[PDB]
Amino acid sequence: KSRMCGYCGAPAPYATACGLDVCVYHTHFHQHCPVIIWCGHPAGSGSCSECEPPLGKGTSPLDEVLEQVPYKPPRTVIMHVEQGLTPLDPGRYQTRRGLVSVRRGIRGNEVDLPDGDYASTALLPTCKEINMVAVASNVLRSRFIIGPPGAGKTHWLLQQVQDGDVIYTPTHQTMLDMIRALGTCRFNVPAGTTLQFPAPSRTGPWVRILAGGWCPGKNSFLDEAAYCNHLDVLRLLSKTTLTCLGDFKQLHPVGFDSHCYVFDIMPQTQLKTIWRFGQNICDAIQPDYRDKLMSMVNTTRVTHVEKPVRYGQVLTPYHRDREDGAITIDSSQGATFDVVTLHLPTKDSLNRQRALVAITRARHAIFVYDPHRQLQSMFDLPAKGTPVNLAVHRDEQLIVLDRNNREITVAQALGNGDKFRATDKRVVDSLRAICADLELE
Amino acid sequence: SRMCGYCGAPAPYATACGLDVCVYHTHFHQHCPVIIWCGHPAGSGSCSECEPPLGKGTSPLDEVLEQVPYKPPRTVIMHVEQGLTPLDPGRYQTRRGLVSVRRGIRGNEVDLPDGDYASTALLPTCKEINMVAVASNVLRSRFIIGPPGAGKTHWLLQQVQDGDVIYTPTHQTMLDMIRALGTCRFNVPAGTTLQFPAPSRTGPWVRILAGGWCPGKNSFLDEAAYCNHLDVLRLLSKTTLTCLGDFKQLHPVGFDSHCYVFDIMPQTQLKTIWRFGQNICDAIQPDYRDKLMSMVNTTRVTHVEKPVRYGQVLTPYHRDREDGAITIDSSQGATFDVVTLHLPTKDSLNRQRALVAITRARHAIFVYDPHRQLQSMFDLPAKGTPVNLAVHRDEQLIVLDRNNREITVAQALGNGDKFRATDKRVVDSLRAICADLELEH
Ligand SMILES: [Zn+2]
Ligand SMILES: [Zn+2]
Ligand SMILES: [Zn+2]
Ligand SMILES: [Zn+2]
Ligand SMILES: [Zn+2]
Ligand SMILES: [Zn+2]
């Protein structure tokens, strides 16, 4: 029945409002939110003889991380205490006589408060289940795998996960992405997803949304780690070690300056062999990666157009510029296409991470429309030729670009004696069907 | 009431082979005996009606039947009791000539009042064959010659409607059809030693050729040069066909060549090849009218002086199979990345079986021909490939450089030549292995 302190796992009679469990000493070293102490007041408040002592800065990295998660206090609901029953929700409240926990009874909700009216604040779930001792060691027992785009980190996970293992992943979407590279996996469809999830096949490794806390398994993995909420990572490292796959040079987490500090003190190894694009792309993105990248595939065509084009998937920075099937660059992390157009109509719109992702989505050809010459400032991606015939869909119509980017017909492509380049199944199926009809007409 | 298979007139008799004959045609089926007005077979001077001698028939059918000799069954005894016998349904020749043994909720449903009659069963060989309609229906059908790797089965997907039917000659061919189709109705055959998917019942049908005709809108014949001559006739007794095949690949088992009907149908040939290089295309071009064009890189040809075991090993004779090698005839419609042709026995290679063997692999073929059998049929020179092949041996991925030297994937990454595979399991190994080289070393 006794809680241990999340900073100093000594006995923890108290709790922050956010709410981490603190000991008698650490009540004055959590400047992130108030902590009510032995007297009815919060520490630091000059309200009496006990809350008079001043607060101090905390030495934990947890403190430094809360500096980017501002405390939004919820408003006081009031505590109407029966004989022992009260009409309130789950529990974990700070009244005025110390911490109070109301427990789920189906014969009413029971509290160990004598009959009266007490003003009560709900505790947040921000630092619940965080144990900074456990984190301190576990992080040193964990590993981080830098998978650049197209190095197949997401695949190495498959040739290593076993069915008693748990895979954590940050968003509903990345969750789904992982379900499908696995196939048979166990999971729960998140409350309030706006997507359609397969059937939870009940004989596979587990897949869980990072925000769900820790769940026991044998080995645990963190998918798209450099992107994950800092506090939910810590909630994991308070209970297990982790095998972390991600990339610092792509997108940062959505409410934070950079990636969580725990990855910076892990041992880090980086995949160097790339299965998705040509060496010219690899060379363009090399500055962001320590070890040399070696491309297993052909030169990816690079073309810089003067006026906008619509070849392949169109990627664009800002939502307002999306036309006719295009998508945001951010929404394309993890995705792969044969051909992308990089659509840059709006100025000061392309940050270095957003540029990385975009020039590494395509396999065979990228078309860059960069009137404000933004991309040259971050990546040296010179125009590059391929002596092949590109095949891509556009408005459900197979079109063919020759080695000089002229739209020609399937028939003319067979005439010019250059091979077709394409990987997408539907493109390749349209391509093979059409060549049949040409011969049988 | 039954018409005649030769002569669509009232057919009150029937050959031993299952073909309904009129009164005229009784004397013109030299393939097997048939019984007349009396109890005797014509020809046999053994009565007062069977004295006139037999005549040669003038249908192509008679000509086909010269290739399936009549094997007459040992005479069963038909125990007619209750009007029911304990023999299996069909047609028999008792005492009385024509007697039909039906389905029955009673069990058998026989006429011929009770007694115990020596019976002979008719075979199912010419059952439901109407040469009149065949004659008229061939001239309405079409034949698509699809050389190996022309993807004839792909053009078929792009034409078939849900009411259409697709016949196919073997269990294996049916499977491969079903998988290329996806959504398709079928019944798994009885006795199958293979693993069929679940018969999605919202698709075009897919039936086994020996399962006779079944209603449908448009019908199709798969690997038509390979199909049983008489089973094809059964189809042309009821509908027109669209036939996809290759006369220059295997013959139907137990026949000289393909069924004559394809010779009097219009024929067109696919010219575009998606499987092997133009070197292999040139090697087989004598067997095809129209020029073959390859859409893929050269295939390596290596003539070995010792037997090897690189890739999938093909060999003509069951006797020579060792360590997972497969006969050449088992490999029609299969595709591999690398094949080894294992030619250790003399006079083993007809022309069809070489055509098949040398058009199975995508990227490399190794020939072991110490009896120099192949040269007599196909000019298959040696050709080099500036690449590193990859293939499994015995659960172990081995790599061959551009000089056919086994190397390690480590060394492969060093010689700076791209890898060349397509098989999924091979490519996943290659990937997993390159991961482990940079991750654990
Ligand atoms: Zn403490
Ligand atoms: Zn706090
Ligand atoms: Zn106080
Ligand atoms: Zn007749
Ligand atoms: Zn017969
Ligand atoms: Zn007679």
**Domain coordinates of chain B in residue numbers?**
1-71, 73-122, 131-270, 298-439
Rg (CA), chain B: 27
Residue pair B205/B184 in contact (Cβ under 8 Å)? The answer is yes
Instruction: Give the chain B residue nearest A245 (alpha carbons).
Output: B439
The DSSP line for B233-276 is HHHHTT--EEEEE-TTSPPPTTSSSS-GGGGGS-EEE--EE-SS
Sign of CA dihedral A109, A115, A121, A123: negative
DSSP secondary structure string for all residues of A313-335? EEEESSGGG--TT-EESGGGTT-
Beta strands (DSSP E) in A3-115 are: 14-15, 21-22, 77-81, 93-94, 99-100
φ/ψ of B291, rounded to 5, equals -60, 135
CA–centroid distance, A212 to ligand 4, in Å, is 81
Q: Kind and range of the H or E element at A222? A: strand A220-223
Q: Is A51 annotated as a binding residue?
A: yes
Ligand (nearest to CA of B124) = 5
CATH of domain B131-270: 3.40.50.300
Sign of CA dihedral A72, A73, A77, A79: positive
Distance, CA of B159 to CA of A414 (rounded, Å) = 23
Distance B441 CA to ligand 1 centre (A): 41
Distance CA(A35)–CA(A15), nearest Å, equals 6
CA of B226 to the centre of ligand 2 (A): 77
Burial A153-176 (b: 16+ CB within 10 A, else e): bbbbbbeebeeebbbbbbbbebbb
Structure tokens at A423: 């990987």
B243 is in an annotated binding site: no
Please tell me what DSSP assigns to residue A385: -
Q: What is the Cα–Cα distance from B430 to B426, expressed in whole angstroms?
A: 6
Question: Which residue has tokens 């072991």?
Answer: B368
**Å from CA of A53 to ligand 3 middle:** 10
- Nearest of A13, A8, A58, A53 to residue A33 by alpha carbon: A58
Query: Shortest CA distance to A139 belongs to which of A259, A7, A261?
Result: A261
B225 burial via Cβ count (<10 Å: 0-12, 13-18, 19+): buried
Give every CB contact of residue B150 below 8 A, 6+ residues apart in sequence. A436, B270, B271, B272, B273, B274
Q: Which of B268, B269, B272, B387 to mutate to test the interface with A (most CBs of A within 10 A)?
A: B272
Contact A330, A353 (CB under 8 A): no
CATH no. for A132-271: 3.40.50.300
Nearest one of B425, B412, B420 to B390, comparing CA atoms: B420
Contacts of A242 (CB under 8 A, 6+ apart): A138, A142, A143, A168, A220, A221, A222, A225, A233, A236
Residue of A nearest to B144 (CA): A440
Q: Annotation-wise, does B7 bind a ligand?
A: yes
- Token readout for B127 is 């059952």
Closest chain B C-alpha to A362 CA, distance in angstroms: 19
CB contact under 8 A, B272 and A152: no
CA–CA gap between residue A93 and residue A75 (Å, rounded): 12
Q: Is A39 annotated as a binding residue?
A: yes
Across the interface, of A294, A419, A437, the residue whose CB is closest to B413 is A294
Kindly calculate the radius of gyration of chain A based on its CA atoms and give it in whole angstroms: 28
Q: Which ligand is nearest to the CA of A34?
A: 2
**Alpha helix positions (H), B293-408:** 351-357
* Distance in angstroms (rounded) separating the CA atoms of residues A114 and A80: 10
Q: What is the whole-number distance in angstroms between the Cα of residue A57 and the centre of ligand 3?
A: 20
**Looking at chain B, which residue has its C-alpha nearest residue A418?**
B295
- Identify which of B2, B1, B6, B3 has the alpha carbon closest to the alpha carbon of residue B27: B6
From first CA to last CA, the distance across chain B in angstroms is 81
Closest Cα in chain A to B157: A433
> B179-202: string of b/e by CB count within 10 Å (b at 16+)?
eebeebbbebeeeeeeeeeeeeee
What are all long-range contacts of A241-244, with beta carbons under 8 Å and residues at least 24 apart? A241/A138, A241/A139, A241/A141, A241/A142, A242/A138, A242/A142, A242/A143, A242/A168, A243/A142, A243/A143, A243/A145, A243/A219, A244/A142, A244/A143, A244/A144, A244/A145
Which neighbouring-strand residues pair with A393? A398
Tokens of A77: 């609901």
Identify the helix (H) or strand (E) that includes residue A416: helix A410-416
Hey, what amino acid is at B285? Answer: Q
CA-to-CA distance for A439 and A418, rounded, in angstroms? 19
State how far the Cα of A316 lies from the Cα of A381, in Å rounded to an integer. Answer: 17
Q: d(Cα A293, Cα A273) in Å, to the nearest integer?
A: 6
Q: What is the rounded (10 degree) CA torsion for A226, A232, A234, A240?
A: -100
Reduce the DSSP state of residue A304 to 3 states and report it. strand
CB A100 within 8 A of CB A112: yes
Does residue B383 sit in helix, strand or coil? strand
Q: For residue B310, give every residue at least 6 positions away whose Cβ sits within 8 Å of its Cβ, in sequence order, or none.
A: B338, B340, B364, B366, B391, B400
Which residues face A94 on adjacent strands? A99, A121
Distance B262 CA to ligand 4 centre (A): 25
Determine phi and psi for B377, rounding to 5 degrees: -125, -40
Q: Identify from A279, A294, A296, A419 which residue to disrupt to test chain B contact, counting B C-beta atoms within 10 A and taking the largest count.
A: A296
Q: Which strands sit side by side in the sheet containing A407-408, from one edge to the other?
A: A407-408, A398-401, A389-393, A420-421
Q: Which residues of B touch A270 (CB under 8 A)?
A: 438
Residues of B in contact with A436 (CB under 8 A): 150-152, 154-155, 158, 270, 272
C-alpha distances out from residue A421 to A115, A150, A431, Å? 78, 18, 11
